[PDB]
């Protein structure tokens, strides 16, 4: 935010006044998420009689 004002007057009346204001703001956000799960079950059976 920025603002400037200037005024000058001198009688011989004459009066002059100038004001300037400029405001600018920017917001940026980002969100990333990842989830991975692996489940493996290996069962082997062998029987001889």
């Amino acid at each position: 935010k920025s603002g400037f004002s200037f005024g000058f007057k001198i009688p011989g009346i004459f009066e002059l006044g100038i004001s300037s204001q400029s405001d600018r703001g920017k917001h940026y956000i980002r969100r990333t998420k990842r989830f991975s799960h692996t489940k493996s079950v290996f069962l082997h059976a062998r029987s001889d009689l």
Partner: protein
């Protein structure tokens, strides 16, 4: 009659959390008809899990 059974149970758990937040704002104004004003802030926030 022989019997031999072996069980090898293993469980591992690991969790890490880190968060960093930094915020800085600076504003300066000087007037001597002359008027000047400046205002600006900055904010930063980050978190990971």
């Amino acid at each position: 009659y022989r019997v031999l059974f072996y069980v090898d149970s293993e469980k591992l758990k690991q969790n890490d959390f880190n968060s960093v937040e930094e915020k800085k704002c600076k504003s300066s104004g000087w007037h001597f008809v002359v008027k000047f004003s400046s205002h600006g802030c900055k904010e930063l926030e980050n978190a990971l899990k």
